[PDB]
Each structure stands twice: as C-alpha cells, then as structure tokens.
Amino acid sequence: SGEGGVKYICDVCSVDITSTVRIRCADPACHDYDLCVPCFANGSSSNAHKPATHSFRVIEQNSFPIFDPDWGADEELLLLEGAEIYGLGSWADIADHIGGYRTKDEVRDHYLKVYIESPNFPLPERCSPYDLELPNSISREEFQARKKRRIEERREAAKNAPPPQPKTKPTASIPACHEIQGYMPGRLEFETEYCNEAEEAVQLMSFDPGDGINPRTGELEPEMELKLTVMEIYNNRLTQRVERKKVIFEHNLLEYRENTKAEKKRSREERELLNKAKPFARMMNRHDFEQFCQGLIDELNLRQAIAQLQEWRSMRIGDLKSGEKYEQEKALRIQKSPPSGAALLVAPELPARYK
Amino acid sequence: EKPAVIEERNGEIEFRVVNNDGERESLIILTGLKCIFQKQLPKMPKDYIARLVYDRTHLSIAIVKKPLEVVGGITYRPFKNRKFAEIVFCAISSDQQVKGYGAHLMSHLKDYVKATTNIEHFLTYADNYAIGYFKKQGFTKEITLDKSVWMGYIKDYEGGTIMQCTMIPRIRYLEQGRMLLKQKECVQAKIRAFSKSHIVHPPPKQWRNGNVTPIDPLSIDAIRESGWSPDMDELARQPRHGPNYNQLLHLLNDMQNHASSWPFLVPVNKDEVVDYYDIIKEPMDLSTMESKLEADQYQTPEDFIRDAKLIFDNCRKYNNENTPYAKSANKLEKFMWQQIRQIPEWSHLEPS
Amino acid sequence: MGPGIGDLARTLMDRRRRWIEQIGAVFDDEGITKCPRVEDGDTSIFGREIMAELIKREKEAWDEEVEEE
Amino acid sequence: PTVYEIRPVLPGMSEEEIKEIYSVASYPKSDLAHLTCGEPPDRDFSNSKPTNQINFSTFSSYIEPYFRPFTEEDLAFL
C-alpha cells in the first residue's frame, strides 16, 4: 500500500478501531493494549488485561465543530494529513481520504476559506484556544445526528445516481484549424519553416562539462570558439524566419480564397501588370501597395478609354449614346462576319472621382 | 528538510533560469538540458527537441552544480493573456535521480512563475511512466478549464495523457514543509485542549466487583459526553471505496503502465470511423470501465473480468485477426491473466 | 569523433569574422531588412514632402524629352 | 520567523532584492518578447475547423513570387 499511515487493530477481537471511540489498558503490565468499545463493553479480556482492578482510558473520536459548522476535528486533520502525503493541491484523492462523500469541489472550497482566505494567513482566525463557543453552541448528539442524516441520504442518492457517461475522446487541441495544412494560428508558427533543416547542424552538439574559459590564457579554447560560432549562424537563421513571417501577416496573404477570386475577376492585361509588380511588396506597407497597384490600373484604363474615343470621332459619331449603340452593332457585325473600367469612363455620366 | 534543501543552502547546487539570449552561459545551460531530454525521450526525433529547447519564446529552469554541470530542468511556454502556461519537457539525470530533486524543482518553478506573472493554470501532456510523479505534485487527470481557453493553443503529443493543475493563490511553495506543520500544530493544540483521553478513569463500576457484564457505552459519563452512538460505530468501519479498490488500483495502474494496452487507453472517435459503433453494440474501453468502477456499478469481480473480456472481443470484432489490433488485443489478454494468475483469489476464474 | 582544431577551421573563423566586422558596417542601417508596418503610423515611403520634388523632376524630364522629340 | 508569502515586485529595485522575491536566484535580463511576431489574437478557436485544407505545396508556390531576389530584369519594369 502506498499510504504511509498506520492501521490500528484491536488486540482481542481484531476489529479495526482507528476511526471510532476506543479504550486502552493503561496498566504497565499491558503495553499498547487497545480494547474496542464492544470488547470493553462485552469485557472480552486477553493476555494480561484485567477489566476489574486496572484503571483505563477512554479515547474519544473528537467529533465536534471547531471552525466550520459542517466540519469536525477528525475531518480537519485528515485534510491536513492528506496534504502531507497526497500533496497540497491534489484535491481528488484527499477528498476520498477525508470520506463523508465530499466531492473535490467542497473540499477545495473549504480549505480556501478556512486557511488560504484567512486574514491570519499562516494560521486560522481562531488560533486562540481560549475561544470555545462553537463547541458549546451545538451539542455533540445533535451534530452527530446531522452527520448520520447527511451520510445516509448521500448514500441513497449515490445508489440511485445515474451512471457516469463514458469519457469521450480527449479534446485534442489540433492547432491545424486554419485553412492551410500545417499552420497554427494560435501559435503563429508553421510546421515546415523557411530553413527547417537548419537544426541538422546542432542537434548532435555537446559541450565539455565545467569548461568555457582557458585556465592559462583566459581566452576561449579553440574548440569552444568554434562551437559557439556554429551557434551564431543558427540564431541568424531564426531571425530570417521571423522577418518572412512578419511580411506574410501583413498584406493578408493567408486568405487564399479572397486573394484568388479577385485575380480571377480581373482581366488579362491587369493580371499581367499586377503579377509584374508583386515582388516590391516587401518594402511597402499595406496601404502603399494598394495605392501603387491601383495607380497602374488607373493609367491603363485611361489609355484604353482615350484610344476608344478617338476611334469614334473618326466615324462621325457625335454623342456618347450613339457611340455605345455603334459598338453593340459592330459586335453583332463581327459576329455576323459587369462593365469594365474602360466602359465606365465612357459612360454618359462620369464617375465622381474623375471631377 | 530533504537532501536537496540542505545542498542548496550550503551552495552545492543552484538554479538558473535561462533563455536563448545568445550569451555564452545561456547556451551551455540550454545545450545541457537538450542532451538530458534527448536521453530520456528516445522515441521522439532529435531535431524536434533541438528546435523546442533553443526556441526564443520558451523559458527553462535548470539545476546547476559548481563546475557548470546541469542535472535537470523543465521547459514551458507562458501564455500571459490566457492565464495559463504549458509544460513541454521534464526530466532529471537517471544517475542522480535518487536524491529527490523532482519535488524541489517543481516548487521553484511554481514559485518563480507565481511571483513574476499572473498565470494560474498549468497544462501538460504527461508521459506514461511519469504519471505518479505528477499526481503527487497536485496535478489531476480531470480538466476544469473551458474548451475555448486552451484548444488550438497547446500541442498534441501522441502517447500522452493530458493533465491540469490550479495553483493556490497567495502561497509560497518552497517553505511548504514548515507551513503545513504550523497549520498541523495549530489544529492539534486545539484538539488537545478538549480530549479527555488523558484522564486515567477507574475500572467500570459494574466490573469493580469482579463480575464482567455488558455495559452500554452511552451510560458512562465520559463516553456519553463524547457523543458516541451505535450508528457511528458501525458506519465508521465502511471504507468510501470498494474493499478491493486498492488491489484493483494496483492492477489498473499495472495494465495502464503496460505498453501493450496502448490502443485501449482512449475510446475510438465516431467521426473517424462510422461502423465501429454500428457493429459493436457495447463499445467499451479502459476509461469507460474506470468511470463505472468509480460509480460502484461493478458489484462483483466477475463484472470486471467480463468487461475486460468484452474489450478484447470488441477489438477482435472490429479489427481482423491478421491485423495487429487483434493480435495485440489477445496478447494483452494474456498479460491480464498473468496479473490475475499472480492473484490467488482470481486465479480460478479463468475458463478452460 | 576526432585532437587539435584543424587549421582550415582556425583560418575560416577569422575570414568570416573579418567579413562581418569590416564590410558589414556599411549595411548597419536598420531598414535594409525590415518591412515598415502600418500600425507604426506615418511610415509610408510616399511622403508628400519628397513626392513634391520627384514630381517636379519627372515633369522636367518630360519637357526635355518633348523638346528632343 | 521567516516570511510566508510572495512579496510583489516593484520598479527600479536592486538586483539582490529581485532574487529574494523569486527565491530561484535567477532571471534572464531581456525577455526577448519584442522579437515575437505579436501576441496571440486571443480569440475562440473552438469553432469547428474547416474540412478542406489546401496542399501546402500550392501555398508554398503561391507566395514564392513575393520573395524572389531582385534582378535587373525587374529593374527595367520601373
């Protein structure tokens, strides 16, 4: 048994007596001769015990409140004794040791109020033995009656209690939630980094115990200065990774669905231009990159509109309405043989941002 | 005071908290811890351990001897805003394990984090053979934190068993051994202010004449004031758990300690496999039986044996004999009967 | 597993150290490797105070090209 | 006789006193937290994760154009 306690057995009936009212033979002839109340009631004597002419002692169970109206002396000790063995903090087992069907929560709450939340931090508040009100405020028989009453109903509740549901599979954290296999948004760390093979050079490294400085010269010995130099490179490798991660967070490059859709929506010429200016994002912040790209699109669309209009004026078209009509008929003729940026500038009403 | 206590006081040992700043000493201490963890965890790759220890977001508390010798230490990553910290590695050199540094190292780590930040909860993935050490240090296998707090943040480790702790506020763990004694002394003196056992009472008046006849305990003045009752006397001799709990607890730990029971540590997931529940009308694993045992639904040993047999049958039923699932399942069955046969009481329950 | 350090390893550390200490001083400016962040504030590399001069110079070049053209 | 509690820290305190608070005779000088990419956004990840990830190879090739070295070929675009 892992428990470090001592089990007490009566010397006559061999009935466990540790947790009840008990009597002992105080005569020097008998040493550590304990007689349970039933034995000392029925008077079954053994060895040198004489129930007639030797004076004895009544060991009481010390069942009475001291601090809390719902706790007695025995429960308090088993709480403190459990702390020594099961360790202060392990509330599951210590609650089992105390008995009385007090779930770990009640035991945990009790200790915090009684001891941890006490103003006299290292001690309780009623450290003075002279205060004896709580013992005399409730009689022992009444307090015992409540203990028997709570115990029996709790036992009845437990017997009628529903069976516990089987433990579901442990809720694995699975940090791969993000919609990219091998990314951990909770940790901001990828699984396959820029130079994931950078650890291959220092994962067998070992150091000479107790060294670090030459006893004679006072300078690092040649092996040590070489070993540290191969650690400096690894640190720089870590820093390079961080900068790569820092850039990726900005510009919102983790939105595969959103970034792609717009690229699909755009036309062919715009797609080529944006693809050509992609590398420079390493140097500009988010807004500057947006301004930079938008400007290129603005110039390209303006050229198309101006070229479109100059073609109309050579055909003798003299109104924006008839120009669109002609384009529709031309599309039908070439077939016979949302609007784009170049189509919004040539509309009858100009956009507000071009005034 | 354990040997670790005296050694630190006299200066034999010393604790160093070091991160990968880039100094000379910080690198030596980190590298020493790296080798120790590598020795004790041969299953995991060496590259993975090197990355975690030499990371820039982790800390590490180590025990260092006079000639820059490192004996043990722990590693953790504190989530300051989430009010909890994760423990990722822990080990002490096998040669020096007898001293008992495990208890004294945990106290320093708990004290240091407590007096430096506002973290409350610890979460870890304990090893299979380290469960005993963690339990004695206040940890529990039941989790009280909410799902959202730690899901997606800590890292899963196959072959582990998650555990949780709740540091008690406003306490200094290092001087625990003296503090609880004081609370023990405070209560004990209170008890000694009332107990009448110190009174050497005369022989019972009924037996003073040499005749031994039954005497009601409630009749005596001392006993009656003690509030003894027939009810409490009979009730005090019934242990909270079943009479065989300790023996089964020994066996339960043994089977869990056995590496051959790994597939049955946790139940199968419904999402991963759909036909597992459809084929098995009584799907059971070790966790399910243990919870039912805690509920006292198992009245007799035969229930435990039948449940253990049904586990193997379910594994054989869902998984083919040729597959390792059933062969290991039958191999584990042999291990159970090895323990049961070692027990004379249950040796006769094996069928022919 | 080996002994003394080889000469090649002794003459390479200084070569690496000489390169870093002397040449590297030129690149000391912190902006050579960082990407300015929006949160910092007015970190745009397109400040008006400088764009005013660039536009004027670009206009100057255009006029010169037109005169040549 | 001794102090049975953890006294709080205070700004600008002597080194020896700082070790007395910790009792570990230890602390690093720089926290190194400034090199962190940033604090975790402190959100709720309990939401059911997506069931269709994209091959990490595709993402690796998706961001590659954003990091290629500069060359005179793109020094003529501008």
Q: After which residues is chain D broken (C to N over 2.5 A)?
A: none
CB hemisphere CA count around A157 (13 angstroms): 7
Q: Write the DSSP assignment of C4-34 as a string of letters.
A: PPPHHHHHHHHHHHHHHHHGGGGGG-GGGS-
What is the number of CB-based contacts under 8 A between chain A and chain D?
65
H helix count then E strand count, chain A: 12, 5
Task: Work out whether strand A56-59 and strand B13-17 pair parallel, antiparallel, or are unpaired.
Answer: unpaired
CB contact (8 A) between residue A187 and residue D66: no
Task: Work out whether strand B121-126 and strand B84-92 pair parallel, antiparallel, or are unpaired.
Answer: parallel
Nearest residue in D to A186, CA atom: D40
8 Å CB contact between B195 and B225:
no
Would you give the end-to-end CA distance of chain D in angstroms?
Answer: 77
Q: Any idea what the Cα angle at residue B185 is, between residues B184 and B190, rounded to 5°?
A: 100
The helix (H) or strand (E) run that includes residue A88 is none
Instruction: Tell whether A61 is within 8 A of chain B (Cβ).
Output: yes
Instruction: Tell whether A37 is within 8 A of chain B (Cβ).
Output: yes
Of the candidates B319, B274, B50, B178, which has an alpha carbon nearest to the alpha carbon of residue A200? B50
d(CA A9, CA B298): 29
Which of B86, B185, B282, B321 does the annotation list as catalytic? B86
CB contact (8 A) between residue B232 and residue A209: no
Of the candidates A208, D61, A173, which has an alpha carbon nearest to the alpha carbon of residue B67? A208
d(CA B134, CA B105): 12
Report the residue count for chain D: 78
Of the candidates B174, B137, B135, B131, which has an alpha carbon nearest to the alpha carbon of residue B2? B174
Report the residue count for chain A: 355
Q: Any idea what the Cα angle at residue A110 is, between residues A109 and A114, rounded to 5°?
A: 120
What is the number of CB-based contacts under 8 A between chain A and chain C?
39
Q: Write the DSSP assignment of D8-72 as a string of letters.
A: PP-TT--HHHHHHHHSSS---S---GGGSS---------SPPPS----HHHHHHHHGGGTPPP-T
d(CA D78, CA A280): 11
Residues of chain A in contact with residue D47, where contact means CB-CB under 8 angstroms, are 177
The helix (H) or strand (E) run that includes residue A59 is strand A56-59
What distances in angstroms separate CA B140 from CA A191, A273, B108, B131, one per listed residue? 31, 60, 20, 10
> What is the phi-psi region of residue B38: left when phi exceeds 0, alpha when psi lies from -120 to 50, beta otherwise?
alpha
d(CA A119, CA D26): 31
C-beta atoms surrounding B12 within 10 Å: 12
- Name B91's bridge partners: B73
Of the candidates A19, A1, A20, A3, which has an alpha carbon nearest to the alpha carbon of residue A84? A3
Method: cryo-EM
Instruction: Tell whether A246 is within 8 A of chain D (Cβ).
Output: yes
Residues of chain A in contact with residue D45, where contact means CB-CB under 8 angstroms, are 177, 185-186
Residues of chain B in contact with residue D42, where contact means CB-CB under 8 angstroms, are 81-82
CB contact (8 A) between residue D9 and residue B115: yes
Residue with tokens 């070229």, as numbered in its chain:
A307
Chains C and B touch (3+ CB pairs under 8 A): no
d(CA C56, CA B103): 74
Query: Contacts for C3-8 with beta carbons within 8 Å, 24 or more apart?
Result: C4/A222, C5/A222, C5/A223, C5/A226
Q: Pull the structure tokens for residue B174.
A: 């290092």
The b-or-e profile of D30-67 (16+ CB within 10 A means b, else e) is eeeeeeeeeebeeeebeeeeeeebeeeeebeeeeeebe
Residues of chain B in contact with residue D25, where contact means CB-CB under 8 angstroms, are 14-15
Q: After which residues is chain C broken (C to N over 2.5 A)?
A: 2
Burial of B211 (0-12, 13-18, 19+ CB in 10 A): exposed
Nearest Cβ partner for A43 among B28, B150, B212: B212
d(CA D56, CA A306): 45
Q: Any idea what the Cα angle at residue A71 is, between residues A69 and A72, rounded to 5°?
A: 110
Of the candidates B307, B306, B318, B308, which has an alpha carbon nearest to the alpha carbon of residue B280? B318
8 Å CB contact between B93 and B83:
no
CB contact (8 A) between residue D66 and residue A282: yes
Of the candidates D70, B321, B193, B195, which has an alpha carbon nearest to the alpha carbon of residue A58? B195
Report phi then psi at A180, rounded to 5.
-150, 115
Q: Pull the structure tokens for residue A1.
A: 């048994």
8 Å CB contact between B217 and A37:
yes
Chains A and D touch (3+ CB pairs under 8 A): yes
8 Å CB contact between B218 and B228:
yes
d(CA B305, CA B293): 12
Report the residue count for chain B: 352
d(CA A89, CA A76): 16
8 Å CB contact between B19 and B56:
yes
The helix (H) or strand (E) run that includes residue A190 is strand A189-190
CB contact (8 A) between residue D4 and residue A121: yes
Tell me which amino acid residue B185 is. Answer: E
Nearest residue in C to A239, CA atom: C33
Chain D nearest CA to B21, separation (Å): 7
Q: Pull the structure tokens for residue A340.
A: 């784009």
CA gyration radius, chain A: 44
d(CA A118, CA A133): 19
CB hemisphere CA count around B102 (13 angstroms): 17
In sequence order, what are the residues at sequence separation of 6 or more whose Cβ sits closer than 8 angstroms to the Cβ of residue A237?
Answer: A195, A198
> What is the phi-psi region of residue C66: left when phi exceeds 0, alpha when psi lies from -120 to 50, beta otherwise?
alpha
Query: Contacts for B4-11 with beta carbons within 8 Å, 24 or more apart?
Result: B4/B99, B4/B100, B4/B101, B4/B103, B4/B104, B5/B104, B8/B104, B11/B66
CB contact (8 A) between residue A276 and residue D74: yes
In sequence order, what are the residues at sequence separation of 6 or more whose Cβ sits closer than 8 angstroms to the Cβ of residue A338?
Answer: none
- Name A24's bridge partners: A34, A57
Of the candidates A183, A253, A132, B16, which has an alpha carbon nearest to the alpha carbon of residue D62? A253
The helix (H) or strand (E) run that includes residue A56 is strand A56-59
Q: Write the DSSP assignment of A211-278 as a string of letters.
A: -SS-TTT-S--HHHHHHHHHHHHHHHHHHHHHHHHHHHHTTTTT-HHHHHHHHHHS-HHHHHHHHHT-
Of the candidates B22, B163, B14, which has an alpha carbon nearest to the alpha carbon of residue B90? B163
Q: Chain A neighbours among D 13-32 (CB < 8 Å)?
A: none
CB contact (8 A) between residue D26 and residue B112: yes
Burial of D22 (0-12, 13-18, 19+ CB in 10 A): buried
The helix (H) or strand (E) run that includes residue D77 is none
Q: Any idea what the Cα angle at residue A59 is, between residues B183 and B243, rounded to 5°?
A: 80
Of the candidates D56, B180, B336, which has an alpha carbon nearest to the alpha carbon of residue A86? B180
Residues of chain B in contact with residue D45, where contact means CB-CB under 8 angstroms, are 148, 151-153
d(CA A343, CA B336): 81
Look at residue A75 and give its three-state secondary structure.
helix
Of the candidates B215, B44, D47, which has an alpha carbon nearest to the alpha carbon of residue A51? B215
Burial of A242 (0-12, 13-18, 19+ CB in 10 A): middle
Chain A nearest CA to B193, separation (Å): 7
d(CA B116, CA D27): 10
What distances in angstroms separate CA A247 from CA A233, B226, B254, C36, one per listed residue? 22, 77, 52, 9
**Annotation says B86 is catalytic:** yes
Q: What is the resolution of this structure in A?
A: 3.5
Residues of chain C in contact with residue A237, where contact means CB-CB under 8 angstroms, are none
Of the candidates D27, D24, A210, D16, which has an alpha carbon nearest to the alpha carbon of residue B14? D24
8 Å CB contact between A345 and A301:
yes
Q: Pull the structure tokens for residue D45.
A: 């990840």
The helix (H) or strand (E) run that includes residue A296 is helix A286-313
d(CA A238, CA D1): 49
8 Å CB contact between B114 and B76:
no
Residue with tokens 């899901």, as numbered in its chain:
B151
Chains B and A touch (3+ CB pairs under 8 A): yes
Instruction: Tell whether D7 is within 8 A of chain A (Cβ).
Output: no
Task: Work out whether strand B161-166 and strand B84-92 pair parallel, antiparallel, or are unpaired.
Answer: unpaired
C-beta atoms surrounding A60 within 10 Å: 21
Q: Considering only CB atoms, which residues of chain B are within 8 Å of chain D? A: 14-21, 26, 56-57, 59, 61, 79-82, 108, 111-112, 114-116, 147-148, 151-153, 170-172, 174-175, 178-179
Residue with tokens 């791969």, as numbered in its chain:
A176
Report the residue count for chain C: 69
d(CA A343, CA A345): 6
Q: Pull the structure tokens for residue A280.
A: 């420079």
Of the candidates B288, B281, B347, which has an alpha carbon nearest to the alpha carbon of residue B314? B281
What distances in angstroms separate CA B102 from CA A27, B64, B72, B99, one per listed residue? 47, 14, 9, 9
Residue with tokens 């040992």, as numbered in its chain:
B13
For chain A, the chains sharing at least 3 beta-carbon pairs closer than 8 angstroms are B, C, D
CB contact (8 A) between residue C4 and residue A222: yes
CB contact (8 A) between residue C5 and residue A223: yes
Instruction: Tell whether D53 is within 8 A of chain A (Cβ).
Output: yes
CB contact (8 A) between residue A122 and residue B183: yes
Residues of chain C in contact with residue A250, where contact means CB-CB under 8 angstroms, are 35, 37-38
Residues of chain B in contact with residue D3, where contact means CB-CB under 8 angstroms, are 172
Look at residue A150 and give its three-state secondary structure.
helix
8 Å CB contact between B164 and A92:
no
Report phi then psi at D32, rounded to 5.
65, 5
Report phi then psi at A252, rounded to 5.
55, 55
Of the candidates D3, C41, C10, B98, which has an alpha carbon nearest to the alpha carbon of residue A220? C10
d(CA C46, CA C52): 10
The DSSP call for residue A163 is P
Residues of chain A in contact with residue B2, where contact means CB-CB under 8 angstroms, are none
For chain B, the three-class secondary structure string (H helix, E strand, C coil) is: CCHHHHHHHHCCEEEEECCCCCCHHHHHHHHHHHHHHHHHCCCCCHHHHHHHHCCCCCEEEEEEECCCEEEEEEEEEEECCCCEEEEEEEEECCCCHHHCHHHHHHHHHHHHHHCCCCCCEEEEEECCCCHHHHHCCCCECCCCCCHHHHCCCCCCCCCCEEEEEECCCCCCCCCHHHHHHHHHHHHHHHHHCCCCCCCEECCCCCCCCCCCCCCCHHHCHHHHHHCCCHHHHHHCCCCCCCCCHHHHHHHHHHHHHCHHHHHHCCCCCCCCCCHHHHHCCCCCCHHHHHHHHHCCCCCCHHHHHHHHHHHHHHHHHHCCCCCHHHHHHHHHHHHHHHHHHHCCCCHHHCCC
- Name B86's bridge partners: B77, B123
Q: Considering only CB atoms, which residues of chain D are within 8 Å of chain B? A: 2-9, 21-30, 32, 35-36, 39-40, 42, 44-46
The answer to whether the Cα torsion of B156, B127, B77, B122 is positive or negative is: positive
The number of angstroms, rounded, from the C-alpha of A141 to the middle of its chain's C-alpha atoms is 48
The answer to whether the Cα torsion of A336, A337, A340, A343 is positive or negative is: negative
